[PDB]
Design a protein around this motif. Structure first.
Motif, short mmCIF file in Angstrom:
data_model
loop_
_atom_site.label_atom_id
_atom_site.label_comp_id
_atom_site.label_asym_id
_atom_site.label_seq_id
_atom_site.Cartn_x
_atom_site.Cartn_y
_atom_site.Cartn_z
N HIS B 490 -16.53 -13.89 -29.15
CA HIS B 490 -15.98 -15.05 -29.86
C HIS B 490 -16.44 -16.36 -29.20
CE1 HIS B 490 -12.99 -17.98 -31.34
NE2 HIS B 490 -12.96 -17.23 -32.42
N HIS B 518 -6.76 -13.76 -39.59
CA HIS B 518 -6.49 -14.06 -38.19
C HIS B 518 -7.49 -15.07 -37.63
CE1 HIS B 518 -5.14 -13.60 -34.11
NE2 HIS B 518 -6.31 -13.14 -33.72
N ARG B 521 -6.64 -18.83 -38.71
CA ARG B 521 -5.47 -19.48 -38.11
C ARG B 521 -5.65 -19.68 -36.61
NH1 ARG B 521 -3.33 -14.22 -39.58
NH2 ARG B 521 -2.47 -15.21 -41.46
N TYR B 522 -6.25 -18.71 -35.92
CA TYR B 522 -6.48 -18.84 -34.49
C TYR B 522 -7.74 -19.64 -34.16
CZ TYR B 522 -7.57 -17.47 -29.67
OH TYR B 522 -7.89 -17.47 -28.33
N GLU B 524 -10.80 -22.51 -34.05
CA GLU B 524 -10.83 -23.94 -33.82
C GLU B 524 -11.07 -24.67 -35.14
OE1 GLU B 524 -12.99 -21.76 -32.85
OE2 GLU B 524 -14.94 -22.35 -33.66
#
Lengths: 348, 694
Positions: B490, B518, B521-522, B524
Motif C-alpha cells: 500500500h 475499505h 474510507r481508509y 488518503e
C-alpha cells in the motif's frame, strides 16, 4: 486546515442544542431551547435553511444562544422503525402452489422499480399495491409473498404500527415526512399487516375512550385517505375486514385489487413442504405421500410441525439419528388425526 | 456382555472394549441384539458405541454405518496401531460401495449426516498421511467430491477419470458450480494456455461422435470467435471429413454469415445522415469524424475512397479513425487489405503518431487473428525500420495491441527490441506509455516473465514505472487470489490498490465490496478520484443497483476529475442494459454552466447508454437522438466541441453491426477498451482521439 481548529472553540465546549421555532425573512433566526426561549441569530451562509424546515433541532452556542451551523440529526421516532431491515434470505420461489396466485402480486410490485422502461413509456401506471387477507390463520403467509419485495429496495414491516392507536402524531404528514426523506433513498415499500385497532372488541382497558378512541382511530382513517396521496411509499394492507375504510378513502386509493389466500390443497401442501426440505436435506424414510393424503385443506406450516412433534418425543428416547422407532410414532400421529376441525356439524 | 443391558444409566459403556479386547471376541452379536431390539430399556444407542468397534474389525458393513449415526464423534478416533486401521478401511471402502446402488440404478443416498458425515470424518486421517484413492472415486458420489479435494494448485486438477457421457454430464455440471468459488473454472480453456493439444482434443470430443447435434458449441463457437488461434488449433483437432472444414473455419464464411445476419436484424442509416454531414463537409473538431465511416461501411469502397483521399492532407490526428476504417471495411469478413494496409506505414521517420503512426496501427489492430503467420513477422520487421523516430513513447502504446490480443502465448517476443529505447528516461510520458506497453505484449502466465523484465528494466528501478510494472504481475495471474496478498505494501502512489482489486478478482459474485469499500474510507485524499475506476469489471453482474446508486452523489460534484470518473465508471458496463433512471438523469446535465469537456463528457457518453449496437430499424427510432443533438448544439455557440458531441453519440449509435453483449457472454475482456480509457483521466490534448478508435 486551520478552519476546524479555529472555529471549534466558538460554539463549545459545553454548548446546548435547542429547537428552531420560525424563520424570518430578515435573516433573524428564532431558536427555542426547552422550554420557552427565543433569540435572534443573523447568519447569511451555511444554510441549507430550505432542507431544515421549522420544528427542527439547531445548534446554540454559549455566547450568546446563537447558531454556528445547522445539522440533520435523529430524525423523529417514526423514521427509526423502518430499519432493520428486512430483506431476509427467503425468496418468492421458496413457496409453491401459489404460483398462479402470486404472479398477480409479484408482477404488480415489480412493474415499478425494475423494468421501468415499459412503466415510464405508459404514462398513465398502477402503483397502488394490493391488499392481502385469508383463512384460517393466513395473511402473514401473504407477507411471505412480500419477502421478495422485502429484498427489493427498502421495506417496512408493520403490524398495528405504533403511533396509530398508542399516541398520535401531527396530521397525515408522518407518512409524508417519511416520503420526503425516502425520496432521496427511494424506492420504498410500507407494509400493513393485522390491524388491531378495530380488531379488539374490548380495548384495554377503560379509556378516553369508548367514543373518542374511535375518533382518534378516525384520525388513522383520514391519515390513509389521504391528503395528498401521490406517489409510493407503497401501501399493502393485511387485516380481516376492508369495510373499515370509508368510500371517500378509496377515491385517492388504492383501487387496484385485493387478493385472498385460499386453502392450499394436496398439490400445494407437498410443494411447500418440498421447497423447505429442498435446500436443507430431508430424510428418505419419511414419505410425503401419507402426509398430504391424510390432511385436507391445511397450510404449509401445519404439515411441518406434525413431523416436529414426532421428533419432539423422539429425543426423549435419545436419538439424534434417523431411527425407525419414530416412523411408527410418526405414523401414529397420522393415525392420531386431529389435524383439522371446523363446524359443520350437520348432514347436508 | 451383561453390563451393556443393565438398567443403570451410569456412564460409561464406551472404550470398555479396549481394556479387554480378544477375550470378548469369543462371543458374538447374539447377545447384543436383545438389548437394542427390546424397547423401554436403558442404553439403546449407548450400546452402539461398543458395537461399532466389533463390526468394524469384522469387516461387516452397513452395520457400522447404521450404528455410528448416533456417535458422530468416536468415529474419528476409534481403536492406535495403523496396521489394522488402514487394512479394514480399504475392505470397508469396497464393502460399502457394494451395499449401495444395488437396486440397481440409484435411488441416490439417502449431503447427509449419516453416509456423508461418516465417510468425511474418516477421510480426515485418509487425506493426512497414509494410503490414497478413497471412496469418492469408488462410490462416484459428486457430493463428496467437493470434500474429496485438498488445497492445491488447480492447474493439475483439470484431468479426471473418464466415464460414460451420462455421469460425465453430472460430473462436469456439479464441478462447474464448485469451481465458481475457486480461481480456476472449467471454462478456462479460453484463457489457458495450456495451449497443449489436450483442450483442443477434449473440446472436440465432447460432441463425439455425433456431427449433427454438434452444430452448437462447434459451428456456433467458430463464428463467435474473433481470434484465429481458436480456429487454428481446433482445425487439427477437428476430425470431421478431410481438410475441407476450412470453409466454415478461417472466419471467412463465419464472419460473413454473422455480418449478413446483423444486416438482417439491422440496419443502420447510411445515405440520410452521412450525406447530410457531407453538406456540412468536415467538422472543425477533427476528432470523432474519422471512426464514423469505419464500422458503418463496411464494405463500400466509395465512402472508403473519400476517407483516404481527405486524410492525405495530413492535418493533425484526424487520420486516426479514417485509416482504421480503410482496413476494417474489407476485413469485416476476410482477409483483407493487409497488403496495401502496411504500405502507408513506410511511405509516410513518422515522425509522430498523428502522421505515419496511424497507418502503422492499422495492420496491428485491424489484424484480428493475424499472425496467419505472415502479419506477425511483418509487424515485427516493420517496427525495426522505424525506431528513433517512433520512438519510445507515443506509438509504443498501440503496438502491443497487435500481438497479445490475437496470441497471448506467441513465441515471437517484441519486448526486447522495444525496450532498447527506454534510455529516454522521461518519467512523465512513460506513465501512460509503459503502462500497457509491457502489459499488452503477452498474457505471460509462466511467472518467469515478471522476474526477467523487472531485473533488466529496473536495474536499480525507475521509482515510477515500477508501480505499473508490478501491476503487470497482478494482471498476469488472473483471479488467482494472490492479489489480496500483494496489497499489504500500500504505497503512497496508490495506483497499486485500484488496479489490484479490479483485475485481481474475477468471479461471478462481487465479493469485493468489503475490500473496495475499505480502501476508499481508509485511503488518503485524491485516492477517491481513482477509486471508481474498478467499477468497469466487478459490476458486470448487477449493473443496475450498484452503479447508479453510489455514482449519484459523485456525479453532482463540482470537481472535474471526480465528475469525469463518475460517468466513466458507469461507462460501458452501465450501457449494456437501458433503464428509466439513466434516461431521467439526462435532464439538468446539459443545462449545467460548467465549462471544459467534462461537462459534455457526462451527458454525451450517457446518451449511448440507451443501447449498444441495437437499432435503429428495428428497433429504437433514431429521431429521438437527432432531436436531442440538435437542441443542445445551439449553445455557446461554438465552442467547436458542440460539433464533437453530435458526432459522438452516433459513433457507437449509427455503427451497429456488433451486439455487445457483453462482450462477451464467454467472459473475455476487451484489451482495447481498458487500455485507452485510463488516458482521459489526465486528459491533455490528443488522448481523447486515442479512445475514439473504439
Amino acid at each position: 486546515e486551520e478552519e476546524r481548529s479555529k472555529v471549534d472553540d466558538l460554539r463549545g465546549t459545553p454548548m446546548s442544542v435547542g429547537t428552531l421555532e420560525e424563520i424570518i425573512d430578515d435573516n433573524h433566526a428564532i431558536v427555542s431551547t426547552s422550554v420557552g426561549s427565543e433569540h435572534y441569530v443573523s447568519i447569511l451562509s451555511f444554510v441549507d435553511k430550505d432542507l431544515l424546515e421549522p420544528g427542527c433541532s439547531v445548534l446554540l452556542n454559549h455566547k450568546v444562544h446563537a447558531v454556528i451551523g445547522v445539522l440533520m440529526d435523529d430524525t423523529d421516532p417514526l423514521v427509526t422503525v423502518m430499519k432493520v431491515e428486512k430483506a431476509p434470505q427467503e425468496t418468492y420461489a421458496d413457496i409453491g402452489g401459489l404460483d398462479n396466485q402470486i404472479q398477480e402480486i409479484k408482477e404488480s410490485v415489480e412493474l415499478p422499480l425494475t423494468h421501468p422502461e415499459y412503466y415510464e413509456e405508459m404514462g398513465i401506471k398502477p402503483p397502488k399495491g394490493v391488499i392481502l387477507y385469508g383463512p384460517p390463520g393466513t395473511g402473514k403467509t401473504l407477507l411471505a409473498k412480500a419477502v421478495a419485495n422485502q429484498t427489493s429496495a427498502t421495506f417496512l414491516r408493520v403490524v398495528g404500527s405504533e403511533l396509530i392507536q398508542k399516541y398520535l402524531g401531527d396530521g397525515p404528514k408522518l407518512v409524508r415526512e417519511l416520503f420526503r426523506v425516502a425520496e432521496e433513498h427511494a424506492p420504498s415499500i410500507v407494509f400493513i399487516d393485522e390491524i388491531d385497532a378495530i380488531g379488539t372488541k374490548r380495548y384495554d382497558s377503560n379509556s378516553g375512550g369508548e367514543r373518542e378512541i374511535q375518533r382518534t382511530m378516525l384520525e388513522l382513517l383520514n391519515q390513509l385517505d389521504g391528503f395528498d396521496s401521490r406517489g409510493d411509499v407503497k401501501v399493502i394492507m393485511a387485516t380481516n375486514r376492508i369495510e373499515t375504510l370509508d368510500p371517500a378513502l378509496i377515491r385517492p386509493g388504492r383501487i387496484d385489487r385485493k387478493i385472498e389466500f385460499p386453502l392450499p390443497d394436496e398439490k400445494t401442501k407437498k410443494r411447500i413442504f418440498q421447497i423447505h426440505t429442498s435446500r436443507m436435506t430431508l430424510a428418505d424414510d419419511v414419505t410425503l405421500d401419507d402426509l398430504i393424503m391424510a390432511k385436507d385443506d391445511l397450510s404449509g406450516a401445519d404439515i411441518k410441525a406434525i413431523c416436529t412433534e414426532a421428533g419432539l418425543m423422539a429425543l426423549r428416547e435419545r436419538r439424534m439419528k434417523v431411527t425407525n422407532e419414530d416412523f411408527k410414532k410418526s405414523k401414529e400421529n397420522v393415525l392420531y388425526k386431529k389435524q383439522e376441525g371446523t363446524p359443520e356439524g350437520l348432514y347436508l | 456382555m451383561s453390563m451393556s443391558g443393565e438398567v443403570a444409566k451410569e456412564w460409561q459403556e464406551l472404550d470398555d472394549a479396549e481394556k479387554v479386547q480378544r477375550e470378548p471376541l469369543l462371543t458374538l452379536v447374539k447377545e447384543i441384539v436383545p438389548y437394542n431390539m427390546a424397547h423401554n430399556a436403558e442404553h439403546e444407542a449407548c450400546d452402539l458405541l461398543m458395537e461399532i468397534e466389533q463390526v468394524d474389525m469384522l469387516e461387516k458393513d452397513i452395520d457400522e454405518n447404521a450404528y455410528a449415526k448416533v456417535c458422530l464423534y468416536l468415529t474419528s478416533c476409534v481403536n492406535y496401531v495403523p496396521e489394522p486401521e488402514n487394512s479394514a478401511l480399504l475392505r470397508c471402502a469396497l464393502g460399502v460401495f457394494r451395499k449401495f446402488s444395488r437396486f440397481p440404478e440409484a435411488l441416490r443416498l439417502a449431503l447427509m449426516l449419516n453416509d456423508m458425515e461418516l465417510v468425511e470424518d474418516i477421510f480426515t486421517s485418509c487425506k493426512d498421511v497414509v494410503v490414497q484413492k478413497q471412496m469418492a472415486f469408488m462410490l462416484g458420489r459428486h457430493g463428496v467430491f467437493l470434500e474429496l479435494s485438498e488445497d492445491v494448485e488447480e492447474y493439475e486438477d483439470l484431468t479426471e477419470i473418464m466415464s460414460n457421457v451420462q455421469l460425465n454430464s453430472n460430473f462436469l455440471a456439479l464441478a462447474r458450480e464448485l469451481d465458481i468459488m475457486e480461481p480456476k473454472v472449467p471454462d478456462d480453456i479460453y484463457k489457458t494456455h495450456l495451449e497443449n493439444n489436450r483442450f483442443g482434443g477434449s473440446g472436440s470430443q465432447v460432441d463425439s461422435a455425433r456431427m449433427n447435434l454438434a452444430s452448437s458449441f462447434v459451428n456456433g463457437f467458430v463464428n463467435a470467435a474473433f481470434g484465429q488461434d481458436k480456429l487454428l488449433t481446433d482445425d487439427g483437432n477437428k476430425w470431421l471429413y478431410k481438410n475441407k472444414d476450412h470453409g466454415m473455419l478461417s472466419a471467412a464464411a463465419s464472419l460473413g454469415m454473422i455480418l449478413l445476419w446483423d444486416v438482417d436484424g439491422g440496419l443502420t442509416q447510411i445515405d440520410k445522415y452521412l450525406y447530410s454531414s457531407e453538406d456540412y463537409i468536415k467538422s472543425g473538431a477533427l476528432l470523432a469524424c474519422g471512426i464514423v465511416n469505419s464500422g458503418v461501411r463496411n464494405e463500400c469502397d466509395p465512402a472508403l475512397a473519400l476517407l483516404s483521399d481527405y486524410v492525405l492532407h495530413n492535418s493533425n490526428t484526424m487520420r486516426l479513425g479514417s485509416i482504421f476504417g480503410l482496413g476494417l471495411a474489407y476485413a469485416g469478413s476476410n482477409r483483407e487489405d493487409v497488403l496495401t494496409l502496411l504500405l502507408p506505414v513506410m511511405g509516410d521517420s513518422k515522425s509522430s503518431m498523428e502522421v505515419a503512426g496511424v497507418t502503422a496501427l492499422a495492420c496491428g489492430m485491424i489484424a484480428v487473428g493475424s499472425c496467419n503467420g505472415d502479419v506477425t513477422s511483418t509487424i515485427l520487421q516493420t517496427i525495426m525500420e522505424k525506431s528513433e523516430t517512433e520512438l519510445k513513447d507515443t506509438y509504443a502504446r498501440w503496438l502491443p495491441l497487435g500481438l497479445g490480443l490475437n496470441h497471448l502465448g506467441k513465441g515471437e517476443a517484441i519486448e526486447a527490441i522495444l525496450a532498447a529505447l527506454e534510455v529516454v528516461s522521461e518519467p512523465f510520458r512513460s506513465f501512460a506509455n509503459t503502462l500497457v506497453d509491457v502489459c499488452a505484449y503477452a498474457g505471460s502466465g509462466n511467472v518467469l516473465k515478471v522476474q526477467q523484465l523487472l531485473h533488466i528494466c529496473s536495474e536499480h528501478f525507475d521509482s515510477k514505472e515500477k508501480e505499473e510494472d508490478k501491476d503487470k504481475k497482478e494482471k498476469k495471474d488472473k483471479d488467482k487470489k494472490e492479489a489480496p496478498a500483494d496489497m499489504g505494501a500500500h504505497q503512497g502512489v496508490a495506483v497499486l490498490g485500484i488496479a489490484l482489486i479490479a483485475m485481481g478478482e474475477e468471479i461471478g459474485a462481487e465479493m469485493a465490496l468489503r475490500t473496495f469499500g475499505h480502501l476508499l474510507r481508509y485511503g488518503e485524499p485524491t485516492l477517491r478520484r481513482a477509486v471508481p475506476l474498478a467499477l468497469a469489471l466487478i459490476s458486470v453482474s448487477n449493473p443496475r443497483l450498484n452503479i447508479l446508486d453510489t455514482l449519484s452523489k459523485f456525479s453532482h460534484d463540482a470537481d472535474p476529475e471526480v465528475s469525469y470518473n463518475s460517468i466513466f465508471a458507469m461507462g460501458m458496463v452501465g450501457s449494456g442494459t437501458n433503464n428509466a433512471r439513466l434516461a431521467a438523469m439526462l435532464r439538468q446535465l446539459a443545462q449545467y454552466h460548467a465549462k471544459d469537456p467534462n461537462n459534455l463528457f457526462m451527458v454525451r457518453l450517457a446518451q449511448g447508454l440507451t443501447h449498444l449496437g441495437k437499432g435503429t430499424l428495428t428497433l429504437c427510432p433514431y429521431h429521438s437522438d437527432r432531436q436531442l443533438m440538435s437542441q443542445v448544439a445551439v449553445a455557446g455557440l461554438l465552442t467547436v466541441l458542440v460539433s464533437f458531441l453530435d458526432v459522438r453519440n452516433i459513433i457507437l449509435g449509427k455503427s451497429h453491426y456488433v451486439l455487445y453483449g457483453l462482450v462477451a457472454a464467454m467472459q473475455p475482456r476487451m484489451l482495447v477498451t481498458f487500455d485507452e480509457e485510463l488516458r482521459p483521466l489526465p486528459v491533455s490534448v490528443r488522448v481523447g482521439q486515442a479512445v475514439d478508435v473504439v
